[PDB]
């Protein structure tokens, strides 16, 4: 199944009353932050509040990325979730303001389920006998039909090779995709026609297909700008046509959710565009993440501010606290990886690995869980014993023992 | 010329597809779907569906056609232009070559591709028609219509040979 680094996330475990369970979907800890993120996912699912900002204040090494992934998995596939690395902003050819604004347009999306009839082409109905009137038959495996087409489609027909045995896909907006060499063309058992040899296209003539599709506005802007957007003519036209599409009853808007990591490592001009553009009435909700604490804002060289965030940006932002843990549940979290791994472990090796986890950090034990099972597979043991983990604790060193040597 | 007729009537049948059953017929070193015995026996190969393939495509000889599926569609264009759903919607399979299994579905699938979907077509293969004109002759002779139009002697001598044209 190709399990990634963390695959514990399958939910967030919120009940109807609004309580937080002790162990739900491998997310043990922080019931206050559990309720604080339940409030904001209810705010996302309520579809009434846009223009908010969430900061996850905590020490480095708590696992707030798993909390954001739990938010994204509770939302699922309906709400578009696009995380942004802080190093995705520093571009060379495109300015950073436009990158942040295009991320804000990646947030906002719509869904306008529709229809589309397929035509699929007969074999040979090249009848230009009028040019306004073209008769094209169809010979599919279900049977034969005919249709009259206005001259165009035919002007797309003579552009491509229309010979004995071709496919003609005709869309609703005169979008013709054509092939060559179908059905049968083996006349005298001769050489290559150098075409595509496809069997019979089983299926009838007239289907009525319905697809629910989520469309982002940035793909719309890319498809409309080409045959840095103007904020007086282009995006206002997009806003007007989306207003017309939702007033006629075609598309349905969904709110935008973003998640930004290493926010404090951005430039101060990105900050003064960020807390100016989140003041708009159309601004999506963006969950910010600050990694380290009190440092210097990039571009100031003297201004001291907490969490690397200026005073104008630190205001009007909700703050959720994520503190450290207690060691007596660390052996539980390793167990959450064990049922993810598929190989059961013993009881004393869990104790030694929990001792190594409470020695320096939990992530060191989580990363050493994999070579323990690897040496258990090499040596032939069905479970992980204490000798393999006590050998891999001495063979592989962390940053503290590397700074000690 | 008599045991081979029994092999044709007992072993040979009409397959579904010709190219697909040609693709499957290779690497037949262990699959018991092709080889079968009779009475020399003298083990046979995959020609049990290539023989009824001649009726569907005569291209191996080079006499006339390359099937049967297309001539019925290319031939029946008559006054029943208002009478064409009278024409095609009643197909009667009879004779001796319709004894092979797998014939009805393949003939229906080959005539379905060249005639419209909305036409309520019906391809019916009964179980009786080994002697089917005999059944028609014994049905008409018992439905008291033979004595109404009688064409015999008393009329062959009074009218020389002009007696079996206007009546029948």
């Amino acid at each position: 199944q190709r399990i990634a680094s963390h695959s514990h996330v399958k939910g967030l475990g919120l009940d109807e009353s609004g309580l937080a369970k002790q162990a739900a979907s491998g997310l043990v800890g922080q019931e206050n932050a559990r309720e604080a993120c339940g409030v904001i996912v209810e705010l996302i699912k309520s579809k009434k509040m846009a223009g908010r900002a969430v900061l996850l204040a905590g020490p480095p090494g708590t696992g707030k990325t798993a909390l954001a992934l739990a938010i994204a998995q509770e939302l699922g596939s309906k709400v578009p979730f696009c995380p942004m690395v802080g190093s995705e902003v520093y571009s060379t050819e495109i300015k950073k303001t436009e990158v942040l604004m295009e991320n804000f347009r990646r947030a906002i999306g719509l869904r306008i389920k529709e229809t589309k009839e397929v035509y699929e082409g007969e074999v040979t109905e090249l009848t230009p006998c009028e040019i306004s009137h073209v008769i094209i038959g169809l010979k599919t495996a279900k049977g034969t039909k005919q249709l009259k087409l206005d001259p165009s489609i035919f002007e797309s027909l003579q552009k491509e090779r229309v010979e004995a045995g071709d496919v003609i896909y005709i869309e609703a907006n005169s979008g013709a995709v054509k092939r060559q060499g179908r059905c049968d063309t083996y006349a005298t058992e001769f050489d290559l026609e150098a075409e595509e040899y496809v069997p019979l296209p089983k299926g009838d003539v007239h289907k009525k297909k319905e697809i629910i599709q989520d469309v982002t506005l940035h793909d719309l802007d890319v498809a409309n700008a080409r045959p840095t957007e103007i904020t007086d003519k282009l995006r206002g036209e997009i806003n007007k046509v989306v207003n017309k599409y939702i007033d006629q009853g075609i598309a349905e808007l969904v709110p935008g959710v973003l998640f930004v990591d290493e926010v404090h490592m951005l430039d101060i001009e990105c900050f003064t565009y960020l807390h100016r553009a989140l003041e708009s009435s159309i601004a999506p909700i963006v969950i910010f993440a600050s990694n380290r604490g009190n440092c210097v804002i990039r571009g100031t060289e003297d201004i001291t501010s907490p969490h690397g965030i200026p005073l104008d940006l630190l205001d009007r932002v909700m703050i959720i606290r994520t503190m450290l843990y207690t060691p007596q549940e660390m052996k539980q979290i390793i167990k959450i990886r064990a049922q993810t791994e598929g190989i059961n472990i013993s009881e004393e090796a869990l104790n030694h690995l929990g001792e190594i986890g409470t020695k320096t950090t939990l992530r060191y034990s989580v990363q050493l869980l994999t070579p323990a099972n690897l040496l258990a597979k090499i040596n032939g043991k069905d479970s992980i014993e204490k000798e393999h983990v006590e050998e891999i604790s001495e063979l592989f060193y962390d940053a503290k023992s590397s700074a000690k040597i | 010329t008599h045991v081979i007729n029994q092999v044709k009537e007992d072993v040979c049948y009409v397959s579904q597809d010709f190219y697909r059953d040609m693709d499957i017929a290779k690497l037949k070193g262990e699959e018991n779907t092709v080889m079968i015995d009779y009475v020399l026996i003298l083990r046979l190969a995959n020609e049990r569906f290539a023989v009824p393939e001649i009726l569907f495509n005569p291209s191996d000889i080079g006499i006339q056609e390359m099937g049967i599926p297309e001539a019925i569609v290319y031939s029946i264009q008559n006054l029943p232009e208002e009478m064409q759903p009278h024409f095609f919607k009643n197909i009667v399979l009879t004779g001796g070559n319709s004894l092979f299994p797998g014939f009805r579905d393949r003939v229906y699938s080959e005539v379905r591709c060249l005639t419209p979907t909305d036409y309520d077509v019906s391809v019916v293969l009964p179980e009786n028609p080994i002697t089917y004109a005999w059944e028609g002759g014994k049905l008409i002779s018992e439905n008291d219509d033979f004595e109404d139009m009688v064409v015999t002697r008393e009329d062959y001598e009074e009218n020389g040979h002009s007696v079996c044209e206007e009546k029948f």
Binding site: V241, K244, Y245 | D120
Partner: peptide
């Protein structure tokens, strides 16, 4: 038994230009 089939064929051949005018309305109004 053909007359109901001709009525259904005329029904399809009447509803198909209705969908054609619907395509023209969704392509020429917005």
């Amino acid at each position: 038994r053909l007359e109901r089939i001709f009525q259904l064929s005329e029904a399809h051949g009447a509803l198909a230009p209705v969908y054609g005018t619907e395509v023209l309305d969704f392509c020429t109004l917005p």
